[PDB]
Amino acid sequence: GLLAAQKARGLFKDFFPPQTIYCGFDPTADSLHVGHLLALLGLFHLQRAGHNVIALVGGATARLGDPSGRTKEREALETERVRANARALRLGLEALAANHQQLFTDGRSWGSFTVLDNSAWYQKQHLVDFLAAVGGHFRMGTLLSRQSVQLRLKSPEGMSLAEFFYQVLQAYDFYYLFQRYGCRVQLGGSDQLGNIMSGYEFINKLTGEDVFGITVPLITAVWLNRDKTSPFELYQFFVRQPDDSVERYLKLFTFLPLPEIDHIMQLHVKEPERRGPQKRLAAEVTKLVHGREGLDSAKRCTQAL
């Protein structure tokens, strides 16, 4: 099964409670990083399986900032720096989706991939109208009882109004896309369980409609941007890896079928000195983020050493 393969690979951590699925990426920087990569893959796996996916840029929401999993209040971001980053991200996601569509074809009939931005619909949204329209459908108890929200709420200083209100936007986003694109599935890291929850409860209060969430593991400075992190630098992060991990990361960052992976490892023991599973993971990934060129301008770089 589709979900089977992904839960099995270790990509689809959990789920609650032709389709359309989405995941958001807050443009709090101009570059995506290796962690973002994992959520994005989740989309790529659903896309290959034939589904339509939407990778959303948080032009609006990054002005505020996600409180989720954070113990400290963020440095409010200049409304313009966030506008820039949002345009960098869009570019970055169309870029990735680009490599993925040529360098990893499988003859399967694929689904669409679309980059949206929530600023598009927030720029037409006036405070009291929003509040008047929806505010009456968010029970305060509900919002107050997210586990995502305790680190900041229960903090010594407390949580700004903004931080708290953040979840409400994300909840609304899910509602919006669901309305306009019939999208009934949201996906993100585990840190996003709370927010997604708000979404499906909210949608459920309004329409008896059942939508869904899916999470993926969180992995534990590494940029998808050639400018920030060279294709070579990036290769090194995946090559300098412990053997106990290269197992999971293969199942994590690559499309190699599980059997192909299996062999790679069983083979690795007959040749531990080879760093073979790393030389594979590193290749697969750098191919996806930086294209064939990037792989080459990294293969080459190390080799001479």
Next chain:
Amino acid sequence: GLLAAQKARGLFKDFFPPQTIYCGFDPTADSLHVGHLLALLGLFHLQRAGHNVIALVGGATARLGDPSGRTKEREALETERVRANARALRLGLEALAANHQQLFTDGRSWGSFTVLDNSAWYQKQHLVDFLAAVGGHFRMGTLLSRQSVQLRLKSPEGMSLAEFFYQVLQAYDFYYLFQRYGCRVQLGGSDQLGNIMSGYEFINKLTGEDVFGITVPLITAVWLNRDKTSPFELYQFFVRQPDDSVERYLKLFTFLPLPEIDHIMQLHVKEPERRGPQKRLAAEVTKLVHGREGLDSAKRCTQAL
């Protein structure tokens, strides 16, 4: 002293922690009532004393509804019915201010009286911008700890997001007028202690500036609108009054100096059958709300009976 006379009269309940002072009136109906009258007098007393006052219509805030002192959630109001009422109120306050400026002159140099509406500045306010601009200055603990807010919060059903967010707007209003009109005093009934609090703390977080609040007693169906409640009907509310009260209501709803009042009462005992203090209170008030005509078309009405 000015505050002395008002605290003494029983009009200036409390205060915390040429000037400009304001009080808001939510257009949840097209008519003001006798209770509103008290808060408005508070303004009139400050205005006679020479100060500039602003009677604010809550065009925006009445769409939500004030949670303060309420045990139950309000029936969400049609955004259009609220627009109509807001235009009725503006008319009603310019009307009262009218009678007050002819039928109650005292040769003193008076201060300005201005009717504003918050919808004016909320209609230009976009959700994320507001949240982005200010949301970070409202500690959630603060907002969560108003006594105004417990009846609804601690309720079995809980409080909508809207109800809770209400205080935030009122807090912002005070900040707005203070910015634009250097207004540094807000006044309302006692039920409004909480909200006003939010205002001066918020202003204080932003500017070390000290602004202030003043409250007035709450009195315990009676419309300032000739259409709803005839000038005669209204006279009867003030005439059908217990002697233990006519004392306070004179000090409450009239401008008669305290000595003049004193006599009226000491006189009343020599003639209890006269209902003299009531025939005075009733006259004073009906004169202010319905003008000389109204007094007459009420004096006349009863007399023939």
